[PDB]
């Protein structure tokens, strides 16, 4: 086929032939990496996240509950699972359903960290998409919508169910509450969705102790066969508590009681168990190893760890300390008058509404003096903010308030008074507008030195050098408070977080500061008890907020809440399942997984191929020297529009640490779309498949003919079978003389390619037609040589495919014997996939892809 094009007049350029071979060779090599799908994401390599992603991401139709605590990376873990299944072909269509306020968070995270462009489906986008198909969700492969959107219409819900999704992601799944007599519409929608999508990821950090019926109902959504009875599940969790405590004491060091181990041995039921148990419970020279084998066999028999992952902050340390600094300020008489007239108008207004309103006195003032009324003239919080920023000009400060209107007013007064420039975040801006404001604030280069945020939820952007936070006001519930602090209290952040709270005395602000700090300790330590206690004392705490002058019993309430907080906190830590924690973080095997990816990171093959790829496609690279390159298209582009480019130009980097510091830059790996789209572009057609060249070599007779043939050995099969793990389309380069000697083993490609020069068209065409009959005789000589070569590759693959898939099949069958969380369809998927892989490798052959004729000259 390629020689027919050559003898018919197609002569390709030298760089096209070379790049075609290189791109096929590197594609063949990068597919077989054991860590594919975990390299391309713009994240740090945290072992507990990679352990979850590497386990769940390679399953057939994964159905797990991701229950890591707040800030531990549930969005990143879900993104890594999506990244693998989409890259490998195991999934094609993904549906992410989140609370309405977290939609933009997931769009930014999935695009800027995993290169996944999701489509937000709201009511206006839904009506737009209806014009194109019967099912409007068929118009996009990756969509995000809200719980309210999914539940609102039965007809729209049916379309969402029949849209043939491969993976379903539900964030903040604790919003799905089990109710025996009145399940919410959003519960019913997710329940129906979960029966129609094979792969489901439920995300919620809620402890099962704060609600057990809902926790079991979420697990039953994942596997209704295993989790079929609630009372049985409750009894299982009770029966297991002594085992988790005895195990916890083991790793803690204190040795075990006689009856405490025959209880570990009963749950690990097997005949010869005494030697291992005694070796572990000895603290000898062998006990260190003996416990890893012990807990390993206990994790395989754990009742829920196969489908439930829960890392904790006490288990995975690495979060910064949080320091509270309160600043009590006098109440100006303008607010005194505004509050009084407000109380005269709201004698009937509910205590709940009065409590919330008086938290933001600039809104009370404007509600009587008009919008944009000059409250910033007398508000002492503004003056304190002025003095703090003017005396801290070299550090990045993040200021948060509830309302955008207040945040936008602060930007103006701070600019008009002290000349300080501030980036602003609020819900009224576009994602791209917030992208610029973020990059402006991220500059250590006299960037924006203060970032002003409304209550808008964080979109995952990392501000490395930001460790100082000002709460201009306080949010109304403790869940919003931790979301605020989480903007800087990030994993891997080393500097202590300074939280400054300027507040007005004897107002609802002063009451809320006391309750958050003294009652919940919510500022300096992450609060797992806030919501639970807040619900119990809501209409009680509201009264003290609404009437800050009458403080009778407030100290008693604070005492009540703090004692309940401390008790619930310590109880959650006692019930912490250490065996579940170890399975969640992955131990030393996960640390090795993190090291292996970081070693693979610095890829000189990639930089080489990427620059060779961009020259041919026609991209102009401007190396800014700072580990960053600016890509701008040129005139001589192959395709008019190459996917990832814009006429404004994009910034790229190959270094993972630079990519984390500059999220405005593309993180180029073998798994980046720019690379995968460039590979497919040059390997799609026939460009570079047929050419002729001259070799200036005096050590060889004039006119001697060599042909270098690029064969490709491949099987044909659907991508979901994942045949590329064992036999991707693989090039087999041969270099033949007139007798058929294969010299490719002693003639390195790049060394020999640098000596082959193109021919002008008129001489080149004359030369090809002259040597044709000899070339045909050499082509016939190769067909026998490629056969033995291709048969060695296929037989190598079908043995490696049979060996790998036998291990996976045996591993899942060993688990099913001791674990109830192995689904029937999982065992059938491996058994069927293995048989189909063997059958596709049986029908694998060879073809000639490209050939380059070489004629020796002395000129
Ligand atoms: N490996 C990582 N590398 C870089 N940033 C990370 C990593 N893991 C987490 N982050 C950031 O830390 C923050 C917390 O991540 P999340 O996954 O959202 O935390 P989460 O609380 O477990 O999940 P939700 O859905 O937000 S409640 C985000 O700003 C992430 O971008
Ligand atoms: Cl050329
Ligand atoms: Cl919602
Ligand atoms: Cl419940
Ligand atoms: Cl400073
Ligand atoms: Cl953000
Ligand atoms: Cl407040
Ligand atoms: Cl007040």
From Swiss-Prot:
Domain Helicase ATP-binding: 55-225
Disulfide-linked positions: none
InterPro entries: Helicase_ATP-bd, Helicase_C-like, Helicase_RapA, P-loop_NTPase, RapA_C, SNF2-like_sf, SNF2/RAD54-like_C, SNF2_N
Record GO cellular component, one term: cytoplasm
Domain Helicase C-terminal: 381-553
EC nos: 3.6.4.-
Single GO term (MF): DNA binding
Subunit structure: Interacts with the RNAP. Has a higher affinity for the core RNAP than for the holoenzyme. Its ATPase activity is stimulated by binding to RNAP.
Name by which UniProt lists this protein: RNA polymerase-associated protein RapA
Organism: Escherichia coli (strain K12)
Gene: rapA
């Amino acid at each position: 086929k390629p020689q027919d094009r050559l003898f018919a007049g197609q002569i390709d350029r030298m760089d096209r032939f070379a790049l075609r071979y290189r791109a096929r060779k590197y594609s063949s090599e990068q597919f077989r990496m054991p860590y594919s799908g975990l390299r391309g994401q713009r994240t740090s390599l945290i072992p507990h996240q990679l352990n979850i992603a590497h386990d769940v991401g390679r399953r057939h139709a994964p159905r797990v509950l991701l229950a890591d605590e707040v800030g531990l990376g549930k969005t990143i873990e879900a993104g890594m699972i999506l990244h693998q299944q989409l890259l490998s072909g195991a999934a094609e269509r993904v549906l992410i359903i989140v609370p309405e306020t977290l939609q933009h968070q997931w769009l930014v995270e999935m695009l800027r960290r995993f290169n996944l462009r999701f489509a937000l489906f709201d009511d206006e986008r839904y009506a737009e998409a209806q014009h194109d198909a019967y099912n409007p969700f068929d118009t996009e492969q990756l969509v995000i919508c809200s719980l309210d959107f999914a539940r609102r219409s039965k007809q729209r819900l049916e379309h969402l169910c029949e849209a043939e999704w491969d993976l379903l992601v539900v964030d903040e799944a604790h919003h799905l509450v089990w109710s025996e007599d009145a399940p919410s519409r959003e519960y019913q929608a997710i329940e129906q969705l979960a029966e129609h999508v094979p792969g489901v990821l439920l995300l919620t950090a809620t402890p099962e102790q704060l609600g057990m019926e809902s926790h079991f109902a979420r697990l039953r959504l994942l596997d209704p066969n295993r989790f079929h009875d609630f009372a049985q599940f409750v009894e299982e969790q009770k029966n297991y508590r002594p085992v988790a405590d005895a195990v916890a004491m083991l790793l803690a060091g204190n040795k075990l009681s006689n009856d405490e181990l025959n209880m570990l041995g009963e749950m690990i039921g097997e005949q010869d168990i005494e030697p291992l148990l005694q070796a572990a419970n000895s603290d000898s020279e062998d006990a260190q190893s003996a416990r890893q084998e012990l807990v390993s066999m206990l994790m395989d028999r754990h009742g829920t760890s196969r489908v439930l992952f829960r890392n904790t902050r006490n288990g995975v340390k690495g979060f910064p300390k949080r320091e509270l600094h309160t600043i009590k300020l006098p109440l100006p008489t303008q607010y005194q008058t505004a509050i009084k007239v407000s109380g005269i108008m709201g004698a009937r207004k509910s205590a709940e509404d009065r409590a919330r309103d008086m938290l933001y006195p600039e809104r009370i003032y404007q509600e009587f003096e008009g919008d944009n009324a000059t409250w910033w003239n007398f508000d002492p919080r503004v003056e304190w903010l002025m003095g703090y920023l003017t005396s801290h000009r070299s550090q990045k400060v993040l200021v948060i308030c509830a309302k955008a209107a207040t945040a936008l007013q602060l930007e103006q007064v701070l600019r008009e008074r002290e000349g300080i420039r501030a980036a602003v975040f609020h819900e009224g801006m576009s994602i791209i507008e917030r992208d610029r404001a973020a990059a402006w604030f991220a500059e250590e280069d006299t960037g924006a030195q203060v970032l002003l945020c409304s209550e808008i939820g964080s979109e995952g952007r990392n501000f490395q050098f930001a460790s100082h936070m000002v709460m201009f006001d306080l949010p109304f519930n403790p869940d919003l408070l931790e979301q605020r602090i989480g903007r800087l209290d990030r994993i891997g952040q080393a500097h202590d977080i300074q939280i400054h709270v300027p507040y007005l005395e004897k107002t609802a602000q002063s009451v809320l500061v006391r309750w958050y700090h003294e009652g919940l300790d919510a500022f300096e330590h992450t609060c797992p008890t806030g919501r639970t206690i807040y619900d119990s004392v809501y209409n009680d705490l509201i009264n003290y907020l609404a009437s800050p002058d009458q403080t009778e019993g407030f100290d008693d309430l604070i005492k009540n809440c703090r004692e309940q907080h401390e008790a619930l906190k310590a109880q959650l830590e006692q019930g912490r399942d250490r065996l579940l924690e170890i399975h969640s973080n992955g131990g030393e095997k996960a640390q090795a997984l993190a090291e292996s990816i970081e070693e693979q990171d610095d890829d000189t093959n990639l930089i080489a191929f990427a620059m060779n790829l961009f020259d041919i496609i026609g991209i102009n690279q401007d190396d800014r020297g700072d580990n960053m390159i600016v890509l701008t298209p040129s005139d001589h582009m192959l395709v008019p529009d190459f996917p990832g480019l814009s006429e404004d130009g994009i910034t790229i980097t190959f270094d993972r640490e630079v990519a984390l510091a500059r999220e405005d830059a593309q993180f180029i790996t073998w798994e980046h779309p720019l690379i995968r789209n460039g590979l497919d572009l040059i390997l799609s057609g026939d460009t570079g498949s047929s050419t002729i060249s001259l070799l200036k070599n005096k050590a060889l007779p004039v006119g001697t003919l060599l042909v270098e043939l690029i064969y490709v050995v491949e099987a044909q099969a659907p991508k979901q079978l994942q045949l590329n793990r064992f036999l991707p389309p693989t090039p087999v380069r041969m270099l033949l003389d007139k007798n058929g000697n294969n010299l490719a083993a002693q003639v390195e490609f790049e060394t020999f390619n640098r000596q082959l020069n193109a021919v002008n068209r008129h001489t080149g065409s004359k030369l090809v037609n002259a040597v044709q009959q000899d070339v045909h005789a050499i082509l016939q000589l190769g067909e026998a040589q490629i056969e033995k070569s291709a048969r060695a590759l296929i037989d190598a693959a079908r043995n490696e495919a049979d060996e790998k898939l036998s291990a996976e099949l045996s591993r899942l069958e060993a688990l099913r014997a001791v674990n109830p969380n192995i689904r029937d369809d999982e065992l059938t998927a491996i058994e069927s996939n293995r048989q189909q892989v063997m059958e596709s490798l049986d029908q694998a052959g060879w073809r000639l892809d490209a050939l380059r004729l070489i004629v020796v000259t002395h000129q």
